[PDB]
Design a protein around this nucleic acid. Structure first.
Ligand code: ZN
Lengths: 62, 140, 344
RNA sequence: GUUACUCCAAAGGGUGUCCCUGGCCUUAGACAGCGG
RNA sequence: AGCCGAGGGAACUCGGCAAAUUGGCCCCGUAACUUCGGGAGAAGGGGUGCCUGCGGGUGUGUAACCCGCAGGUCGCAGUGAC
RNA sequence: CCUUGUCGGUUAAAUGCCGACCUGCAUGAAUGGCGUAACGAGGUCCCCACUGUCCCCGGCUGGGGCCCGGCGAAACCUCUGC
RNA sequence: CUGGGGAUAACAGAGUCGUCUCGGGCGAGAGCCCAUAUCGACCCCGAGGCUUGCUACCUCGCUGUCGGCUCUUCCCAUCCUGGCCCUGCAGCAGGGGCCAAGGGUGGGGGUGUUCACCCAUUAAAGGGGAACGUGAGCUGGGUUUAGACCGUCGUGAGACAGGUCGGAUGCUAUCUACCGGAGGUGUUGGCCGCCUGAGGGGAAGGCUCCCCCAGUACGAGAGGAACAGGGAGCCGCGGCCUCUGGUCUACCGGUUGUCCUACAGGGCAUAGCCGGGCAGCUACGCCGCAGCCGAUAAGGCCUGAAAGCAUCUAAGGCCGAAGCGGCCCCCGAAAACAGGCGGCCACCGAGGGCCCGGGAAGAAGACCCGGUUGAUGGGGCGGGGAUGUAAGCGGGAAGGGAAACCGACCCGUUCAGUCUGCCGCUCCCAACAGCCCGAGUGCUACCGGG
């Protein structure tokens, strides 16, 4: 019973949900929902969206 | 036991979803002369009226060689699936998926051809065929 | 020629709306433990857990994913004892005894309740029943039960039912019954944790449907789709016999059928809406409640998997009548996680 | 089988049972068992 | 009569019927064969919004219509619909 | 005609299509013969791309169908109708 | 073209069965020798009506058709799946025969094809009937019109059971039949509730692979089994939406073109187009689907005579199948012996319907919960969720201009604003006022009390 962490919006999501994406080079990604995954593969920037944590990580770099 | 010290098979607990039907083109991930293959059948499958056979990860398929080196084309081979783009559930409930559809060419009795799988492969394939994990430098 | 199996089952025919909304139990199992052979409740919702597998087969000893249905079960009130004798063909009722002080809301179902009927007469009638049961003309004893929805706030009009008792004898059954009449039954006094159950209920309504969805008929070719006959079947039959047979797929009522389901494991019985894991006390109701059902207050059951019916519907469980030979143990499995997150 | 005819099966076979006929045997015959 | 459909991609059918793909403009680059006129928009590829500005052609023109370039920035998408 | 002629190529698999052969049942030179660029809502075989054609179907929209008020026919019809 | 024909063909039916499919008797001979493991000639005797013919009994405007798709059902002369017997059966297998019709018998290539041929798999990829099942069910490739081309035949008009291109697909269901839904009468008084279950339906389950048994028995070696036990999947069936995907013309955002003067907020362009999406529906997701008791078939045995011995049978016993019956699921008091129990009314009034507020149910009807002994709908207050940080104000911004000032976009105020076909509390508004159906009569022939 591990709580995993989304690679798009950075939050902890519960056992029995989500997705793992594997690249052919062995690197792995975790997704909490369909939205985060679609935005990732579409190319959106989570660092401009105030509902992620990349936003605060950038608020620092300002 | 009878003969278990050196074998080719095993048991997986997952049974992934069947997502690649007849007529599908898979990439070849192993270092054999083959580059692309087309599925013409699925081993150990019985169906009904108007249904096509379909395979997933860990399944062996009868295939044709479309592109590849001259001594391999228009030949019928057998191949194990190692990756698929459609998801499939693991026991803890999390779901898994890959980037493309790949296969390794093998012998009708499990022994593989080739000597190195370029890329990652799924764990269920390696649990079911014990000689693949001995080739690939990434198992997930 | 080409062969395939037929489309649909002829074992659930006629496929017609159920005679009643309260289900019906036709047969009862062979139990030796003298106890009531069932309970009833109202369905609340679904969720999921993670548990260590106790059941035989590989995957045993691992952490897996198990979906779960929560069934809300307030206590029952026992108000009746009913005797049966043997007639020319089968059983037939012989005598009934009711309790005197019954709730004001039972007359919402049984309008015509008795008028004088004090404890004097109640005890006299009980005595008559006992002097009859000690004779020999008696074949089995059953209990009469009603639900109490006023406790959870769901409704007032109750449900009334008749349940059986375990054992080969009738005087042990009568002792049990005479001890239980006039009082309340809770689910922990009857059901064990880990039992296999058969669930019995009435399914959801879908309405009038066509044969494609109701029997599995194959949609027709795209030329027929452009002709006006895609979701139709082709043939009502041959020339001889010169009538339509009852085996030919047609349209009609889909849903609201009386169904049964075998071998659903009871995992947990809780008290007052909380589940006391080994470690700490916890709630089951999720954040924001259950959709289309509010909060859980009284008592509840965890059932492995799915069951027939919509949420607020009345369910009836019994101990398994058709169990396998390799049973899982009777004890609450090790639960590692229960989901309280929003289900809407 | 319970079919006048309209509308209904054979060649080949049977220590199934009931009967006719003609040879050979018989006061020790035709099987058994005990031995030559 | 219409809109969307995961994973596969004609395995459907007499037959890829029906639907879908492409799609405007500028620049680059374009075969066989040929009645030397064509083929040819062959094929194949890149670009394309808003804002702040700089220049050119005709013209008396801080009138009017046209032609080239740099920088900044927003979005999954700039012939954004038609 | 015998005929799915035979050899080769194209497919995992070819009563097909294309290229060669010639015992042309019953080709043939203005009832024209052999070719042929460009053209064809002409017949025909392959490749790439594209797709709900198919595996295998699901969901949504508008108009009908269904209920209510109003106006108001016809084709058919020996009698009947397990 | 007309007038007519089943007095007369092609097409399906009836009749018949030479032909056809499926069989049998006898024993020549072949099988190292050995008539019967297997094959069985020459000759003789048959079943069926699934090929084809013969005839011309029905039908000449009923319908004229081949193949394919869809859908249901039957036979056994059994391809696999269960059980057995003989072998020229060591094992693995093969060959030949008996019972058995519960289940299964698929996907593709060229061809209009049926069949036939080929590929890769499979436990195996059986053959037939139902008006050559099935056009008031579709299609329309072939075939039999009207157009045109080639080859042959013909002086010619023209023909070819020779090839090729192209070539119309109508219906408002009168009666019955079937699927589902309602309203009556009856059940010898009316109404509540709860039960029995006569009968009917069922495949609700069928099959395969792996480990072990065991590199064991068997076998010179090569090779190579079985009973018991553990597990997994495919086809089929019945359900659910916690998880994952799809849709979501509720909702949130971004943007093009034009119009409302510009901002702001809006209309139209398929919801204008794009992106995300809760409830709900759905599968590409997930849960569930006993082998046991009884009686039998082929077969294997006991006792046992006819026929002092023998003999599975004549009389009598014991065993023995995926097949029959029951246990299990679905429907079911109109089951005409038209049921049983408890209670309430009748001999004014028990109960019910309309009506009101809603859905967990729905084509109309029916069904379920509530109706001030009240949280049924709305509102207000809060919880949870979906999008994704509102307008206005303040500051910055590539660069321009004498300067005032322009200026796409960025930061802050701001997990914001908008929305909620989801939950909870709270009588602030409305579930009021009412109106109708309704059993109620008796006699002889009686049963048991009076
Ligand atoms: Zn996320």
């Amino acid at each position: 019973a591990r709580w995993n962490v989304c690679s798009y919006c950075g939050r902890e999501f519960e056992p029995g949900t989500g997705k793992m994406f594997v690249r052919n080079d062995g690197r792995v990604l975790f997704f909490c929902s369909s939205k985060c995954e679609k935005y990732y593969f579409m190319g959106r920037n989570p660092r401009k969206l105030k509902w992620t944590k990349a936003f605060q990580e950038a608020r620092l770099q300002r | 036991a009878k003969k278990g010290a050196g074998a080719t098979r095993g048991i997986s607990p997952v049974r992934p979803t069947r997502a690649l039907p007849i007529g599908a083109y898979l990439k070849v991930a192993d270092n054999s002369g083959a580059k692309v293959i087309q599925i013409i059948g699925v081993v150990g499958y019985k169906g009904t009226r108007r249904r096509l056979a379909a395979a997933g990860v860990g399944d062996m398929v009868v295939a044709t060689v479309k592109k590849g080196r001259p001594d391999m084309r228009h030949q019928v081979v057998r191949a194990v699936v190692v990756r698929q783009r459609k998801e499939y559930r693991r026991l803890d409930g999390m779901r898994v998926k890959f980037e493309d559809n790949a296969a390794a060419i093998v012998t009708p009795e499990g022994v593989p051809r080739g000597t190195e799988i370029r890329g990652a492969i799924a764990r269920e394939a390696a649990e079911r065929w014990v000689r693949l994990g001995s080739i690939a430098s990434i198992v997930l | 020629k080409i062969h395939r199996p037929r489309r649909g089952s002829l074992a659930y025919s006629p496929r017609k709306r159920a005679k009643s909304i309260v289900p019906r139990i036709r047969s009862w199992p062979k139990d030796s433990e003298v106890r009531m052979l069932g309970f009833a409740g109202y369905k609340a919702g679904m969720t999921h857990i993670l548990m260590i597998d106790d059941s035989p087969g590989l995957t045993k000893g691992k952490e897996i994913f198990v979906p779960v249905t929560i069934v809300e079960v307030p206590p029952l009130f026992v108000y009746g004892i009913r005797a049966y004798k043997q007639g020319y063909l089968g059983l037939e009722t012989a005598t009934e005894v009711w309790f005197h002080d019954l709730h004001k809301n039972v007359a919402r179902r049984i309008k015509t309740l008795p008028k004088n009927y004090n404890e004097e007469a109640f005890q006299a009638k009980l005595g008559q029943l006992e002097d009859l049961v000690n004779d020999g003309e008696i074949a089995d004893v059953r209990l009469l039960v009603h639900t109490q929805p006023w406790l959870i706030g769901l409704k007032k009009k109750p449900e009334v039912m008749e349940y059986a008792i375990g054992g080969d004898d009738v005087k042990a059954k009568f002792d049990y019954a005479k001890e239980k009449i006039g009082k309340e039954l809770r689910a922990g006094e009857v059901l064990h944790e880990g039992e296999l159950l058969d669930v019995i209920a009435v399914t959801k309504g879908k309405g009038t449907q066509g044969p494609v969805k109701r029997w599995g008929v194959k949609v027709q070719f795209h030329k027929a789709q452009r002709a006006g006959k895609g979701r139709h079947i082709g043939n009502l039959g041959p020339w001889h016999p010169a009538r339509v047979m009852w085996t030919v797929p047609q349209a009609g009522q889909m849903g609201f059928h009386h169904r049964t389901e075998f071998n659903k494991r009871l995992i947990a019985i809780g008290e007052n809406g909380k589940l006391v894991l080994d470690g700490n006390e916890i709630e089951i109701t999720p954040k924001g409640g259950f959709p289309h059902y509010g909060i859980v207050r009284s008592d509840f059951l965890m059932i492995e998997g799915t069951i027939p019916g919509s949420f607020k519907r009345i369910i009836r469980v019994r101990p398994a009548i058709r169990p396998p030979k390799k049973k899982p143990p009777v004890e609450r499995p090790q639960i590692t996680y229960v989901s309280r997150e929003s289900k809407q």
